[PDB]
Design a protein around this ligand. Structure first.
Ligand code: C8O
Length: 699
């Protein structure tokens, strides 16, 4: 069901949840004045969610959340990323360079306080109401001087909600000694890594295991050999009960952003500029990269990761535009604003209508600037690697005309450093030139001559429209065209060379027009932000916060629904639950994506599933729910009707991407790894029996 609900909204929502099959007492889920399941939830490493699953501070999150730390402890001798990692005692658990988990100790509604401070600001157009500086000073004030010093490990933050109509103060408890305890092999942790990304059905055991270490008193402490595991206020019990179709599921985690209060004009702008330009341009870039990856096995190695990375937001935009096209997103925003305009006329205030009008007019006015911005960002800044070639810094240009000879050698040393980072092991000028020709051709078609970055004018003025010739010249003549050409430059460096270098001119020309469009576009954000405060204020006053959740802003939220499959298209039905048999069907030992660990293979053939199989003796892998999630919900605990852990959220299907603007009851699903599979892989792949023994595993 719809919504990423504030903890303080539990009471307003309990009735709907109780009806969807929730059985816990309210204050056992969230209690502002006592221990609750909320205290088992962490923000893991500043982005992901995790959860505490033992009285000895064991933490579950996704494999993709623990990836960097599993890789940091990976050498070619002991490759943990490949084979997994299973510390057989506490002492073998590996500490991590720059890690955190953050508990949400306390949450207070500080609206009346913040609105009261706000009246001491003269300028009625002040953007301080959404400013991290000002909200943080309002937090320090309300907490005390030397609060971080008085209560060590604790910190405070105020955040805006509902476009500045509601403020919450968070007291955060931060632990910094978080050790790697367990990881499955990446074959399991990343099964179908790229193919099955945003895909249901899904067969990935996307989980890793860490432990929170603290001082003797369980107070936060940086890494010390003398740190001992944290005894936490609360951990999740693990259910073996399983799930069945229409079972109550609920989630707690840290969803990043939503756009629930977009006007119709904003959905049109999202479609017609942001999404259509990203689709057009990444299609061209992806087409040229693919062709060259197929042609040469070395280019494939060099360009595989850059290809995958472009693909990520490419698929998201396709998913997004599909929803605009088919799920009536534009219509439903138009309806919401028309209901409020109508209610506003009768209430005798035009403020709401004046607010929607301000947004519409602002969107219409910025359309050219924004089209140009996206064209240059998708087309050139992301499109063409040689846009990110070295610009001699103001200091560097100076120190080449410098009397002092020590300071020219040092300027050329860090221009060499920056050239080496640009023309790395994975850079091909031949590939970049072909991408650049195709991307620039499309760019020159859409952007008229008078709006071009100054250097791109030369295609028309010097090269008679020949994009190929323009690009060939950039590499022929530039000190960054080849190692040899840079080596010739570095031995006899004049600034008169750099100043006129066609690649430095292209790169600086392009970042100039990028910056300039950013600067002319910035002023248009404020009037929308301010009208949005009024718009949401009206929406709340009209209908209440009951069926109108606050956009996600990287804050702790709960979502609820049922375990339920869906129909993606005519005569096709995806069920609520994948099984290990899905693993075997997709196996292909000659595709890294779909390698099956032999230890799991055997577990399958033996039917060695202990208390973890579904009562038909099938082995669950993943399940999906009508819960409302977005990025930030990676690693989020999935609870049954009694608050027992049944799974671990790890993705969302592509048909639900537009759920960030409008919840999609019959398409959008959270993709969840079954806790029974997690237990299976720990037991039968890792042999890490002490982890089962420290958990409170319930029937
Ligand atoms: N699979 C890469 C991680 N991305 C996500 C993880 C979780 C969720 N979620 O709805 O909870 C969404 C995404 C995402 O890519 O949008």
């Amino acid at each position: 069901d719809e919504g990423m609900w504030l903890m303080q909204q539990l009471g307003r929502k309990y009735a709907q949840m109780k009806e969807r099959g929730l059985k816990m007492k309210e204050y056992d889920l969230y209690n502002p004045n006592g221990t609750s399941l909320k205290d088992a939830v962490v923000l893991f490493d500043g982005g992901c969610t995790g959860e505490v699953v033992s009285d000895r501070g064991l933490v579950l999150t996704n494999h993709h959340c623990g990836y960097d730390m599993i890789q940091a402890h990976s050498t070619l001798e002991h490759n943990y990323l490949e084979n997994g990692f299973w510390a057989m005692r506490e002492a073998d658990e590996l500490p991590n360079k720059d890690i955190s988990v953050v508990f949400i100790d306390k949450i207070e509604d500080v609206t009346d306080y913040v609105k009261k401070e706000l009246k001491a600001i003269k300028d009625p157009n002040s953007m301080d109401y959404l400013s991290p500086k000002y909200l943080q000073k309002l937090a320090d004030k309300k907490a005390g001087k030397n609060f971080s010093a008085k209560n060590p490990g604790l910190s405070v933050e105020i955040k805006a909600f509902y476009g500045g109509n509601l403020y919450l103060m968070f007291t955060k408890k931060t632990y910094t000694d978080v050790r790697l305890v367990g990881a499955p092999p990446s074959s399991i942790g990343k099964f179908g890594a790229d193919t099955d990304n945003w895909i249901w059905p899904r067969h990935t055991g996307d989980f890793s295991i860490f432990r929170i270490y603290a001082d003797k008193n369980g107070n936060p402490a940086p890494y010390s050999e003398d740190n001992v595991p944290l005894k936490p206020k609360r951990f999740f019990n693990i259910s073996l009960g399983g799930v069945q179709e229409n079972d109550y599921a609920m989630i707690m985690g840290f969803p990043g952003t939503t756009h629930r209060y977009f006007t119709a004009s904003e959905v049109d702008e999202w479609k017609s500029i942001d999404n259509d330009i990203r689709i057009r341009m990444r299609d061209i870039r992806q087409g040229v990269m693919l062709r060259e990856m197929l042609a040469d096995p070395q280019i494939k190695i060099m360009y595989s990761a850059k290809y995958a990375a472009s693909q990520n937001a490419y698929k998201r935009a396709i998913g997004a535009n599909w929803a605009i096209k088919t799920r009536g997103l534009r219509q439903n925003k138009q309806a919401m604003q028309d209901r409020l305009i109508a209610w506003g006329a009768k209430q005798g205030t035009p403020r709401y209508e004046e607010a929607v009008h301000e947004i519409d007019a602002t969107v219409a006015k910025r359309a050219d600037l924004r089209r140009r911005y996206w064209m240059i960002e998708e087309g050139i800044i992301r499109g063409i690697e040689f846009a990110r070639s070295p610009i001699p810094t103001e200091d560097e240009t100076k120190a080449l005309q410098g009397n002092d000879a020590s300071a020219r050698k040092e300027a050329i040393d860090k221009i060499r450093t920056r050239y080496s980072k640009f023309a790395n092991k994975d850079y091909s000028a031949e590939v970049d030139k072909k991408v650049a020709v195709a991307m620039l051709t499309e760019y020159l078609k859409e952007i008229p001559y008078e709006n071009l970055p100054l250097h791109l004018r030369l295609v028309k003025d010097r090269f008679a429209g020949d994009v190929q010739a323009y690009v060939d010249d950039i590499f022929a003549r530039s000190v960054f065209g080849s190692e040899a050409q840079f080596d010739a430059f570095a031995a006899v460096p004049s600034v008169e060379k750099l100043a006129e270098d066609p690649m430095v001119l292209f790169a600086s020309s392009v970042f100039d027009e990028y910056r300039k469009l950013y600067n002319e576009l910035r002023p248009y954000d404020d009037p929308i932000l301010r009208a949005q405060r009024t718009y949401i204020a009206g929406l709340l006053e009209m209908d209440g916060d009951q069926d109108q959740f606050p956009d996600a802003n990287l804050t702790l939220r709960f979502t609820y629904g049922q375990v339920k499959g869906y129909s993606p298209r005519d005569n096709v039905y995806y069920g609520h639950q994948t099984t290990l048999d899905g693993v075997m069907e997709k196996e292909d030992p000659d595709n890294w994506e779909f390698v099956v660990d032999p230890k799991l293979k055997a577990v399958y053939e033996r039917k060695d599933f202990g208390r973890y199989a579904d009562r038909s003796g099938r082995m669950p892998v993943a399940f999906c729910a009508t819960t409302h999630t977005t990025g930030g919900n990676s690693g989020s605990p999935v609870m049954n009707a009694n608050g027992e852990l049944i799974g671990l959220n790890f993705d969302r299907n592509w048909e639900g991407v537009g759920g960030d603007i409008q919840y999609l009851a019959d398409y959008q699903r959270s993709i969840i790894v079954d806790i029974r599979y997690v237990l299976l892989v720990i037991d039968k792949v890792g042999g890490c029996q002490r982890l089962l023994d420290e958990m409170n595993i319930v029937p």
